[PDB]
Scaffold this motif. Structure first.
Motif, PDB file in Angstrom:
ATOM      1  N   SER B   1      24.631  30.410  73.214  1.00  0.00           N
ATOM      2  CA  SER B   1      26.072  30.196  73.129  1.00  0.00           C
ATOM      3  C   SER B   1      26.779  31.440  72.604  1.00  0.00           C
ATOM      4  N   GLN B   2      27.867  31.824  73.271  1.00  0.00           N
ATOM      5  CA  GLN B   2      28.626  33.015  72.917  1.00  0.00           C
ATOM      6  C   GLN B   2      29.971  32.688  72.278  1.00  0.00           C
ATOM      7  N   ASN B   3      30.194  31.438  71.877  1.00  0.00           N
ATOM      8  CA  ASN B   3      31.454  31.028  71.260  1.00  0.00           C
ATOM      9  C   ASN B   3      31.349  31.264  69.758  1.00  0.00           C
ATOM     10  N   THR B   4      31.949  32.355  69.291  1.00  0.00           N
ATOM     11  CA  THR B   4      31.927  32.716  67.880  1.00  0.00           C
ATOM     12  C   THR B   4      33.053  32.071  67.082  1.00  0.00           C
ATOM     13  N   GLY B   5      33.856  31.205  67.696  1.00  0.00           N
ATOM     14  CA  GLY B   5      35.035  30.666  67.058  1.00  0.00           C
ATOM     15  C   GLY B   5      35.081  29.151  67.132  1.00  0.00           C
ATOM     16  N   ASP B   6      36.302  28.637  67.254  1.00  0.00           N
ATOM     17  CA  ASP B   6      36.560  27.208  67.212  1.00  0.00           C
ATOM     18  C   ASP B   6      36.233  26.550  68.549  1.00  0.00           C
ATOM     19  N   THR B   7      36.075  25.229  68.503  1.00  0.00           N
ATOM     20  CA  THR B   7      35.927  24.397  69.692  1.00  0.00           C
ATOM     21  C   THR B   7      37.003  23.323  69.634  1.00  0.00           C
ATOM     22  N   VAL B   8      38.035  23.481  70.457  1.00  0.00           N
ATOM     23  CA  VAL B   8      39.193  22.597  70.451  1.00  0.00           C
ATOM     24  C   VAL B   8      39.120  21.688  71.669  1.00  0.00           C
ATOM     25  N   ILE B   9      39.258  20.384  71.434  1.00  0.00           N
ATOM     26  CA  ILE B   9      39.280  19.371  72.480  1.00  0.00           C
ATOM     27  C   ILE B   9      40.673  18.753  72.524  1.00  0.00           C
ATOM     28  N   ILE B  10      41.150  18.455  73.725  1.00  0.00           N
ATOM     29  CA  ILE B  10      42.486  17.902  73.925  1.00  0.00           C
ATOM     30  C   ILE B  10      42.356  16.416  74.224  1.00  0.00           C
ATOM     31  N   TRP B  11      43.201  15.619  73.577  1.00  0.00           N
ATOM     32  CA  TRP B  11      43.049  14.179  73.473  1.00  0.00           C
ATOM     33  C   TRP B  11      44.328  13.495  73.935  1.00  0.00           C
ATOM     34  N   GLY B  12      44.196  12.267  74.432  1.00  0.00           N
ATOM     35  CA  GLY B  12      45.363  11.472  74.761  1.00  0.00           C
ATOM     36  C   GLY B  12      45.891  11.590  76.173  1.00  0.00           C
ATOM     37  N   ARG B  13      45.058  11.976  77.137  1.00  0.00           N
ATOM     38  CA  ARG B  13      45.491  12.097  78.520  1.00  0.00           C
ATOM     39  C   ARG B  13      44.870  11.057  79.442  1.00  0.00           C
ATOM     40  N   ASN B  14      43.900  10.281  78.963  1.00  0.00           N
ATOM     41  CA  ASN B  14      43.327   9.183  79.733  1.00  0.00           C
ATOM     42  C   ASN B  14      42.933   8.078  78.765  1.00  0.00           C
ATOM     43  N   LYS B  15      43.287   6.833  79.107  1.00  0.00           N
ATOM     44  CA  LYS B  15      43.050   5.710  78.205  1.00  0.00           C
ATOM     45  C   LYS B  15      41.577   5.555  77.857  1.00  0.00           C
ATOM     46  N   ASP B  16      40.692   5.803  78.815  1.00  0.00           N
ATOM     47  CA  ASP B  16      39.277   5.508  78.660  1.00  0.00           C
ATOM     48  C   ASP B  16      38.494   6.651  78.021  1.00  0.00           C
ATOM     49  N   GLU B  17      39.170   7.618  77.423  1.00  0.00           N
ATOM     50  CA  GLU B  17      38.476   8.708  76.754  1.00  0.00           C
ATOM     51  C   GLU B  17      37.846   8.291  75.429  1.00  0.00           C
ATOM     52  N   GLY B  18      38.092   7.070  74.977  1.00  0.00           N
ATOM     53  CA  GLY B  18      37.626   6.640  73.681  1.00  0.00           C
ATOM     54  C   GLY B  18      38.682   6.848  72.618  1.00  0.00           C
ATOM     55  N   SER B  19      38.255   6.705  71.367  1.00  0.00           N
ATOM     56  CA  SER B  19      39.155   6.814  70.232  1.00  0.00           C
ATOM     57  C   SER B  19      39.274   8.269  69.780  1.00  0.00           C
ATOM     58  N   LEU B  20      40.074   8.489  68.733  1.00  0.00           N
ATOM     59  CA  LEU B  20      40.123   9.799  68.097  1.00  0.00           C
ATOM     60  C   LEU B  20      38.982   9.963  67.102  1.00  0.00           C
ATOM     61  N   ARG B  21      38.620   8.881  66.408  1.00  0.00           N
ATOM     62  CA  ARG B  21      37.422   8.898  65.576  1.00  0.00           C
ATOM     63  C   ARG B  21      36.176   9.173  66.407  1.00  0.00           C
ATOM     64  N   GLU B  22      36.191   8.778  67.683  1.00  0.00           N
ATOM     65  CA  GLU B  22      35.052   9.029  68.559  1.00  0.00           C
ATOM     66  C   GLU B  22      34.812  10.523  68.739  1.00  0.00           C
ATOM     67  N   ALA B  23      35.882  11.285  68.977  1.00  0.00           N
ATOM     68  CA  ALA B  23      35.735  12.716  69.222  1.00  0.00           C
ATOM     69  C   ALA B  23      35.237  13.448  67.981  1.00  0.00           C
ATOM     70  N   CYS B  24      35.700  13.040  66.798  1.00  0.00           N
ATOM     71  CA  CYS B  24      35.319  13.723  65.569  1.00  0.00           C
ATOM     72  C   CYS B  24      33.900  13.396  65.125  1.00  0.00           C
ATOM     73  N   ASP B  25      33.266  12.385  65.718  1.00  0.00           N
ATOM     74  CA  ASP B  25      31.873  12.072  65.435  1.00  0.00           C
ATOM     75  C   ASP B  25      30.912  12.670  66.454  1.00  0.00           C
ATOM     76  N   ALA B  26      31.427  13.249  67.543  1.00  0.00           N
ATOM     77  CA  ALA B  26      30.567  13.819  68.572  1.00  0.00           C
ATOM     78  C   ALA B  26      29.803  15.044  68.085  1.00  0.00           C
ATOM     79  N   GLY B  27      30.234  15.656  66.984  1.00  0.00           N
ATOM     80  CA  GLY B  27      29.555  16.830  66.473  1.00  0.00           C
ATOM     81  C   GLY B  27      29.682  18.060  67.338  1.00  0.00           C
ATOM     82  N   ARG B  28      30.736  18.147  68.151  1.00  0.00           N
ATOM     83  CA  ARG B  28      30.915  19.265  69.064  1.00  0.00           C
ATOM     84  C   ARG B  28      32.245  19.989  68.915  1.00  0.00           C
ATOM     85  N   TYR B  29      33.204  19.442  68.175  1.00  0.00           N
ATOM     86  CA  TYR B  29      34.532  20.023  68.074  1.00  0.00           C
ATOM     87  C   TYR B  29      34.851  20.396  66.632  1.00  0.00           C
ATOM     88  N   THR B  30      35.784  21.339  66.487  1.00  0.00           N
ATOM     89  CA  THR B  30      36.345  21.698  65.193  1.00  0.00           C
ATOM     90  C   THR B  30      37.824  21.371  65.073  1.00  0.00           C
TER      91      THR B  30
END
Lengths: 192, 267
Positions: B1-30
């Motif tokens: 992996s060459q990403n030396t910085g943050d990992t930003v995910i964008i939320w709220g564009r599809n109903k079935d994406e899950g919750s916001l607590r769901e994204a913060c437990d995935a262990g992949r975003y900052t």
């Protein structure tokens, strides 16, 4: 080597959380490095905090090593914030030409990681902090001998504080902080 | 992996994406960017949130939960469509007081806060359409609250831009020098051609050395076919652009397709 950070920034770099904050005074330059290393250079600064660490504090052990060369008032410490209660805690391993202990309430003495710390507490009333203007306490653990490398068993200091009525809340962030105040100097620290 | 910085995910564009607590437990975003806040300004009266229909009632307690795990939450304003702009310098003030008292750290007695006692860490200037309407005055007005804050960025001001420099609709506020982060979209109207992606990102980076500049990528070819880069290809491009001094990381659109494809996992 001319490129550097001179305005407030916060994020992650090479797996480590990092934060640089300044009130704008003087000239302060911050640079992230490989792994958990950072460096900072300041001249006639106003007030700034800087360092790498973890985006969520804990009772973890903290390893730091590097060089710390201030010309004036500056701190090197394990540093972080907790919410409810609002707490700003220092575990000072090194400092420049000013010791804030004589202006704070001496509250006890703890021994951890090879030396004896003097413990202080101090209240900030309507002072700026990480959640805005608020009232909070400052917990201090100030080493009597000034080292530039070692381990910090934060569980020890967190125990004596809770033992002395100084309880922490939900940890916010936790870094090895090179902080300057109306001074100059340079610092290069590795955090692990 | 060459990403030396943050990992930003964008939320709220599809109903079935899950919750916001769901994204913060995935262990992949900052960082999570809540999206969107569609309509404002054109109509001086009501300010229109649009998260495509999510159970808005739990975003608040979810916002506070992520901050307990070291995550940073951003509010994105604007988007693609929805009739947003700031016609008069008065509309920016009302939009400011709306953000400060409904989402940010400010408090009134008669305002409703959709996110409870949780405070959004900053505003993202996702100004895709519209004009050059008064976002610079809104940027200075939001940045001013940082004087009450110590040892942190109390109110972060970020932007999400076109791929081609300059963005005609954000170059006004970007000139202020108040933006902490800039997300350079590779994947929407103003697409970069693949043969000019690296050159365009490096131009953005060299222009704003005091802003952390992040690259905006899609998580699946279904979002943008001519802009998708598989994780292996993105890692190759990162190997070049992360040598920029102010490279900030990657921003992924979005949480919905990152769930399906596992894009950020293979990165």
């Amino acid at each position: 080597e001319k490129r550097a950070i001179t305005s407030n920034e916060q994020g992650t770099n090479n797996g480590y959380f990092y934060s640089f904050w300044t009130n704008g005074g003087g000239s302060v330059s911050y640079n992230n490095g490989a792994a958990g290393q950072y460096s900072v250079n300041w001249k006639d600064c106003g007030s700034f905090t800087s360092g790498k660490g973890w985006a969520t504090g804990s009772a973890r052990n903290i390893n730091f090593s590097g060089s710390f060369n201030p010309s004036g008032n500056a701190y090197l410490a394990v540093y972080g914030w907790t919410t409810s209660p609002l707490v700003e805690y220092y575990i000072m391993e090194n400092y420049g030409e000013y010791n804030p202990g004589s202006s704070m309430a001496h509250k006890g003495t703890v021994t951890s990681d090879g030396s004896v710390y003097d413990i202080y507490a101090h209240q900030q009333v309507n002072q700026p902090s990480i959640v805005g203007t608020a009232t909070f306490n400052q917990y201090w653990s100030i080493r009597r001998n000034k080292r530039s490398s070692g381990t910090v068993t934060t569980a020890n200091h967190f125990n004596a504080w809770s033992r002395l009525g100084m309880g922490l809340g939900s940890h916010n962030y936790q870094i090895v902080n090179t902080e300057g105040y109306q001074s100059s100097g340079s610092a290069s620290i590795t955090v692990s | 992996s060459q990403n030396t910085g943050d990992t930003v995910i964008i939320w709220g564009r599809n109903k079935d994406e899950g919750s916001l607590r769901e994204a913060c437990d995935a262990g992949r975003y900052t960082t999570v960017i809540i999206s969107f806040l569609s309509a404002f300004g054109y109509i001086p009266g009501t300010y229109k949130l649009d998260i495509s229909g999510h159970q808005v009632s739990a975003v608040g307690p979810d916002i506070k939960y992520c901050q307990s795990k070291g995550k940073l939450i951003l509010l994105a304003i604007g988007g693609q469509g929805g009739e947003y702009s700031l016609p008069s310098s008065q509309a920016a003030v009302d939009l400011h007081d709306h953000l400060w008292y409904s989402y940010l750290g400010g408090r009134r007695n008669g305002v409703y806060r959709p996110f409870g006692d949780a405070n959004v860490n900053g505003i993202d200037f996702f100004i895709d359409q519209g004009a050059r309407e008064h976002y610079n005055e809104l940027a200075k007005m939001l940045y001013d609250h940082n004087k009450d804050y110590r040892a942190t960025v109390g109110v972060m001001v970020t932007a999400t831009t076109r791929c081609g420099y300059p963005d005609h609709r954000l170059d006004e506020a970007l000139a202020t020098g108040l933006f902490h982060r800039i997300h350079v979209k590779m994947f929407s109207d103003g697409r970069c051609p693949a043969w000019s992606r690296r050159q365009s990102f490096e131009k953005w980076a060299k222009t704003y050395p005091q802003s952390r500049v992040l690259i905006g990528v899609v998580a699946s070819p279904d979002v943008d076919k001519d802009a998708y880069m598989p994780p292996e290809a993105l890692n190759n491009l990162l190997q070049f652009i992360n040598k920029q001094p102010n490279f900030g990381g990657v921003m992924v659109w979005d949480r919905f397709y990152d769930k399906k494809t596992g894009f950020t996992a293979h990165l």
